Amino acid sequence: EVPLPQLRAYTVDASWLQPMAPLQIADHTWQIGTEDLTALLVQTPDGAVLLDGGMPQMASHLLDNMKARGVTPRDLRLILLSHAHADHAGPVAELKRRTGAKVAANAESAVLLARGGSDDLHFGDGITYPPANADRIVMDGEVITVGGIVFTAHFMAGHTPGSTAWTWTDTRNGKPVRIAYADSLSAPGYQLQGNPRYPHLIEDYRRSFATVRALPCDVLLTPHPGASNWDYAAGARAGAKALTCKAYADAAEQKFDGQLAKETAG
Amino acid sequence: EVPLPQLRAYTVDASWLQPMAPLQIADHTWQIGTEDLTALLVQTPDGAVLLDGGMPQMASHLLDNMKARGVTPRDLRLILLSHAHADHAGPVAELKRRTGAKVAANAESAVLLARGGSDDLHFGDGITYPPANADRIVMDGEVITVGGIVFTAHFMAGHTPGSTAWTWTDTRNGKPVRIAYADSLSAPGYQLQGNPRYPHLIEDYRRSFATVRALPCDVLLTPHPGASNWDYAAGARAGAKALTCKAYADAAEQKFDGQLAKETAG
Amino acid sequence: EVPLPQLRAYTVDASWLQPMAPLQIADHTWQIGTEDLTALLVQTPDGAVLLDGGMPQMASHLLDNMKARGVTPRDLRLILLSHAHADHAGPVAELKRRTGAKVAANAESAVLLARGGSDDLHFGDGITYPPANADRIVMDGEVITVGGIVFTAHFMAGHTPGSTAWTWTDTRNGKPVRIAYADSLSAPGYQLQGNPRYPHLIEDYRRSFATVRALPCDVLLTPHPGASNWDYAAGARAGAKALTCKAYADAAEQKFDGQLAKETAG
Amino acid sequence: EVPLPQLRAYTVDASWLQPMAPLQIADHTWQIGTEDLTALLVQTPDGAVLLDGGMPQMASHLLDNMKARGVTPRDLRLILLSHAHADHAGPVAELKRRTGAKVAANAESAVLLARGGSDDLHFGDGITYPPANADRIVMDGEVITVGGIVFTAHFMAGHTPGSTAWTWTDTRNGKPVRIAYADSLSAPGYQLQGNPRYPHLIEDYRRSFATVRALPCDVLLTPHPGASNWDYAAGARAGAKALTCKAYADAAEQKFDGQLAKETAG
Ligand SMILES: O=C(O)c1cccc([C@@H](O)P(=O)(O)O)n1
Ligand SMILES: O=C(O)c1cccc([C@@H](O)P(=O)(O)O)n1
Ligand SMILES: O=C(O)c1cccc([C@@H](O)P(=O)(O)O)n1
Ligand SMILES: O=C(O)c1cccc([C@@H](O)P(=O)(O)O)n1
Ligand SMILES: [Zn+2]
Ligand SMILES: [Zn+2]
Ligand SMILES: [Zn+2]
Ligand SMILES: [Zn+2]
Structure with missing residues (x-):
């Protein structure tokens, strides 16, 4: 006779858990997560901001990289999120x-976060x-300011109801750089059509493709770097092949349309 | 080079996950969990009460056994807990x-439950x-009444700060049976002395031994049946070897004293 | 010298607090709140649903009217809300x-509710x-079923971010009656343009006028009955003058456009 | 005919709402609340701590006094509470x-705080x-350290289940000063005996008198200054008449015994 199955842990590709030293993106913005999970540190004269943290076991590594950047635990003021899934929050x-x-x-992100x-x-x-x-609860288009860096929320519901793109302007070589940290636009194994838990799912994804396409976007970053063709291990050329926001949205929509067609067939 | 470790699932002995059919304890009280995890159903003319649910993957099994007892999902009115650890809540x-x-x-149990x-x-x-x-938040000694069965809370902090014994009076053969569902009194791998997260841990365990010793207790049940010498697979003799509340408390205190001595040595 | 001001209570027109006996709307749907605050009871063979409760001091009155309808406290299964302000939640x-x-x-309604x-x-x-x-958290267009009555959520953000219309089909004289309980479309004293706490406020109100206009709507009800030209004290003619959903939305949009023009001037 | 009563605001004596400039207690400890509500600021080289905030309308006044002391909003690290009633939290x-x-x-304080x-x-x-x-949830006897000032929690349940005394050591004239911020020991209008919501109320108050009597206590402060014979308007003699912790506990117990006798009679 047969016992109930054991709980199964959330396991991920090794590269998702591979620590890396801080990689600079712009004058105040650094990638401090792992090879394949984004966690952005933005350092201001008035404290630091973290956008995403990756997997649960990455906390101490994040704190180590903050320390390396000159950010003590007391200096971290604000955490922002792309979406509240286990591999980002x-x-x-x-x-x-x-x-x-x-x-x-x-x-939406707050209630999912509070449920773990x-x-x-x-x-x-x-x-x-x-x-x-x-x-703090934020509304679509609301800004948050830390040490003079202005972060704007752009809702892009779909991957989760609370999926958000965050945008801000940094500098590089004396020129402004408009950074867009756009959320995932994937739908891994999702029932897209007629989903009782998410009846307007397809309408929300379509709107989100349009939202992402139109972001202020000199440089695109994504929670999985591969989605925007970043290679965090590639050093000085880490961001060389990065997609525009337009190309990222177009690719996601084409993928999504194919998934819809397959769902109809399958 | 080396990735961070994968998350590890909470895995348990197979017998903890082995489903069993309902085992009657008294006229209105049934064990409906697994061979080695207690989950008590108390059925009243005015709805049902569940005390503990076991492991996370046991929900559907619990609902099946309730159904077998004549309890539909709408009929379940109240859940009570021994303590808010994963293998009981x-x-x-x-x-x-x-x-x-x-x-x-x-x-205490509510805040731990809300943190998962x-x-x-x-x-x-x-x-x-x-x-x-x-x-609903309950205080020490507070009663809750469902369909005329009266449940009394007895706080017994130690294993968790919110550890609780629940007592009620059922019937069997026309005579009252005072049932005591006493929580764990174990301290598995705990730092007992000088614990900064629980400075009065030892004082709380000592008080809890006294509390358990004095419970109204014709029949003792525990979240792990082995702790009170229940054998849920033993049919008509399942409860034959069960400890009194006095013996359960004495055994727990002797074990605890030994663990303290070992901690001092180790 | 001058002390800080005393806390000021939320006081309302007397008619908002004037109890009334249950007023039947359709075969299973009753108004059980006050003369000027809606609280709808829907009675099913499988328990009751309440949509809104009015002001905080109305709890016992609601329970009295439920009792009069044959609904005991145990029979109330579900509470739904128009929006989570003090005079409805x-x-x-x-x-x-x-x-x-x-x-x-x-x-949105859940987080505001949790903040009181x-x-x-x-x-x-x-x-x-x-x-x-x-x-339970619901998504736009999601249904909830109780005793065979199907309730559909239609988000109509504006008055609050979480403002919702609820629709269901009841019967009267052997014929279906599609009931629409549409939320407030007012913006009392709101900063509409360039509001840092609600940057897309105007866009959301415009979408919500369209949503309300298109609801399945044989009979319109609103949290303040006056907004849909209901008169709960008018007995057999209580709903005689009620607006259609189209007229309610048109009136709200005209009012809103006037408020926008005044804000620009003022 | 008669409407339900209007909501009634929580109104208090004017002196409870009368702002005062910061009054120094010891080298790093200041009273910054009102004439008759305590709110203690403790300033460290590593940020500030606030113990209690008084009434809801006192926030801006507290921020003004912090500013006067050289504490900006970013510098406030920690809030501690005596108990989570409206006139302290x-x-x-x-x-x-x-x-x-x-x-x-x-x-206990956290769950009451979360319910407002x-x-x-x-x-x-x-x-x-x-x-x-x-x-952060704290246990009895747990310490919290900020900028080298060590705060110890002493639970003293009764006035609320979560009532806490906070103790720390400051300096004055080169000598240590052991400060005890002891919670209220009043029971205003409470049912003391046989209270179904608080069955061990009397036992908890008795234990709390003993706890307060034994605190490290060169200087006693209380959430209402009058309870410990402080006069915040008396300048250089503000604390001259202050009770010891022993006398405060003895007075509270004598009062409590009288209230018990009256309850038995009344
Ligand atoms: O391309 C993406 O956006 C992407 C790639 C891999 C996995 C996923 C999602 O499943 P996660 O973001 O929850 O991990 N998304
Ligand atoms: O004897 C007991 O009380 C006992 C036995 C086994 C395990 C435990 C605790 O670790 P759990 O109750 O959290 O599982 N307690
Ligand atoms: O016409 C309406 O929709 C209306 C009427 C009066 C007051 C209000 C809002 O302020 P409330 O619903 O929060 O009370 N709304
Ligand atoms: O002497 C005291 O301890 C005292 C004095 C006045 C009022 C009270 C309580 O009601 P509060 O602390 O909730 O205001 N307590
Ligand atoms: Zn995801
Ligand atoms: Zn446990
Ligand atoms: Zn409102
Ligand atoms: Zn109080």
């Missing part, structure tokens, strides 16, 4: 406990992580 | 979504589960 | 404590109420 | 939004305030 609860950081997120990713619209309880509370 | 969030059930717990067992005083984030909210 | 926390009811709401209406985008902390937790 | 939610501050509290003081064991929904979340 994983270490947020632990980072809040170990630093001065407060979380800003939209309502449980009762996911598509994954159920298969991919969970330590829950955390949001300190 | 595991399926609570899912049960709340799939039934009419509301959760009553003390403040994360940031545990002793386990860190090693043993987590889907978070759930409590609908 | 006021008694929700108390109703959850005193009944079997669980709350279903969208993410504090940190409102427009009112600050001026209009607060006892906080409550949502048991 | 009132402005906590707003302070968290406007500063860098995180809240540390025990489980609603569903109080004794007051019901009569005295509510904006809800806030705790960032």
Whole structure:
């Protein structure tokens, strides 16, 4: 006779968990996550901002890289998120406990974060992580300012209801660089049509392709670097092959249309 | 070079996950969990109560056994807990979504439940589960009444700060049976002395031994049946060898004293 | 010298607090709130649903009217909300404590409900109420079924980010009646243009006028009955003068356009 | 015919709302609240701590006094609480939004804080305030360290289940000063005996008198200064008549015994 199955851990490709030293993107913006998971540190004269943290076990590595950059735990002021899945919001609860950081997120991301990713619209309880509370709720197009760097929220619902693109302007060589950190536009194993948990899913993805296409976007970054053709291990040429926001959105829409056709067939 | 380790799932002995048919304890009280995890159903003319649910993957099995007993999802009114660890409160969030059930717990258990067992005083984030909210907060000695069965809370802090014994009076052969569902009194791998996260840990365990010793207790049940010498697979003799509350408390205190001595040596 | 001002209570017109006996709308749908605040009871063979509860002090009155209708506290299964302001969600926390009811709401309404209406985008902390937790989060167009009555959520953001219309089909004289419970479309004292807390406010109101115009709508009801020209004190002619959803939306848009023009001038 | 009563605001004596300039207690410790509500600022080389905030409308005044002391919003690191009633935790939610501050509290205080003081064991929904979340849960006897000042929690349940005394050592004239910020020991209008919401109320108060009597206590402060015979308007003699912790506890117990006798008679 047969016992219920053991709980299964959320396991990922090794490269997603491979630590890297900080990689500079612009004068105040650094990649400090792993080879294949983005975690952006933005350093200001008035404290630091983190956009995404990657997987739950990455907290101490993030703190090490912040230290290397001159950011102590007390200096971390704000955490922002692309979306509240385990491989991007994983270490947020632990980072809040170990630093001065407060979380800003939209309502959808906040409720998923507070559930630790449980009762996911598509994954159920298969991919969970330590829950955390949001300190500030943001609305579409709202700005947050830290040390004079202005971050704007652009909602792009689909991958999760709370999926967000974050944009800000940094500098490089004395010239402004408009950075767009755009969320995933994938739908991995999702039921797209007639989904009772997400009835307007397709309409939301279509709007989000348009949103991403139109972002202020000298440089595009994504939570998985491969999605925007970044190679974090490629040093001085890490961002050389990066997609524009237009090309990223077009690729995502073409992929999405193909998935829809397959779902209709399958 | 070396990636961060993969997340590790909370895995348990097979017998902890082995489904069993309902085993009657008294006229209205049934064991409906697994061979080695207690989940008690108390059926009243005015709805049902569940005390503990076991592991997260046990939700559907619990619902099956309730159905077998004549309890539909709408009939489940109340969930009570021994303590909010993954192997006793595991399926609570899912049960709340799939039934009419509301959760009553003390403040300590409620905050741990809402974190999904994360940031545990002793386990860190090693043993987590889907978070759930409590609908009612109870105080020490408070009663809750369902269909005329009266449940009394007896706080017994130690194993967790929110550890609770639940007592009620059922019947068997026309005579009252005072049932005591006493929580774990173990301290598995805990730092007992000078623990910065739990400075009065030893004082709390000592008080809890006294509390358990004095419970109204014709029949003792525990979240792990082995702790009270129950054998759920032994049919008509399942409870024959069960400890008294006095003997359970004495055994736990002797074990605890030995662990203290070993900690001092080790 | 001068002390800080005393806290000021949220006071309302007397008619908003004037109890009324249940007024039947269709075969299973009743108005059970006050003369000028809507609270709809929908009775099914499988339990009851409440849509809105009015002000915080209305809980006991609601329970009295439910009792008069044959609905005991245990029979109330579900609370739905138009929006989470004090004069519609006021008694929700108390109703959850005193009944079997669980709350279903969208993410925006859930986070405002959990704050008890504090940190409102427009009112600050001026209009607060006892906080409550949502048991189920719903997405736009999602359905909830109770005793065979099907409720559909239609998001209509503006008055609050989480403003929702609820629609369902009841019967009257053997014929179907498509009921639309549409939220407020007012913006009382709001900064409409360039609002940093709600940057897309005007775009959201415009979309919501279109949403309301298109609802399945044999009979329109609104949280303030006057907004849809209901007169709950008018007995057999209570709903005689009621607006269509089209006329309600058109009136709201004309009002809104006038407010925009005044804001530009003022 | 008669409408339901209007909501009634929580109004207090004018002196409770009378702003005062900062009054120094020891080298790093200041009273910065009102004439009759304590709010203690402790300034360290590594950020500031606030113990209590008074009433909800005191947030801006607190921020003004912090500014006068050289503490900017970003410098406020930690809020601690005596108990989570409206006249001590009132402005906590707003302070968290406007500063860098995180809240540390025990489980009981955290759950009451998250409800905004609603569903109080004794007051019901009569005295509510904006809800806030705790960032850190503390256990009895646990320490928190900021800039080298060590704060110790001493639970003293009774006035609320989560009532806490906070102790720390400051300096004055080159000598250590052991400061005890002891919570209220009052029971205003409480049912003491046989209270179904608080069955061990009397036992908890008795233990708390003993706890307070034994605190390290060169200087006693209380949330209402009058309770410890402080006069914040008396300048250089503000603390001259202050009670010892022993005398404060003895007075509270004598008062409590009298209230018990009256309850038995009345
Ligand atoms: O290309 C992307 O956007 C992408 C790539 C891989 C995986 C995913 C999502 O499943 P995650 O972001 O939740 O991991 N998204
Ligand atoms: O004897 C007991 O009380 C016992 C036995 C085994 C394991 C444990 C605790 O680790 P759990 O209750 O969290 O599983 N406790
Ligand atoms: O016509 C309406 O929709 C209306 C009427 C009066 C007041 C209001 C809003 O302020 P409330 O719904 O928050 O009370 N709205
Ligand atoms: O002496 C005291 O401790 C005292 C004095 C006045 C009022 C109270 C309590 O009601 P509060 O602390 O909730 O205001 N307590
Ligand atoms: Zn994802
Ligand atoms: Zn345990
Ligand atoms: Zn409103
Ligand atoms: Zn108080």
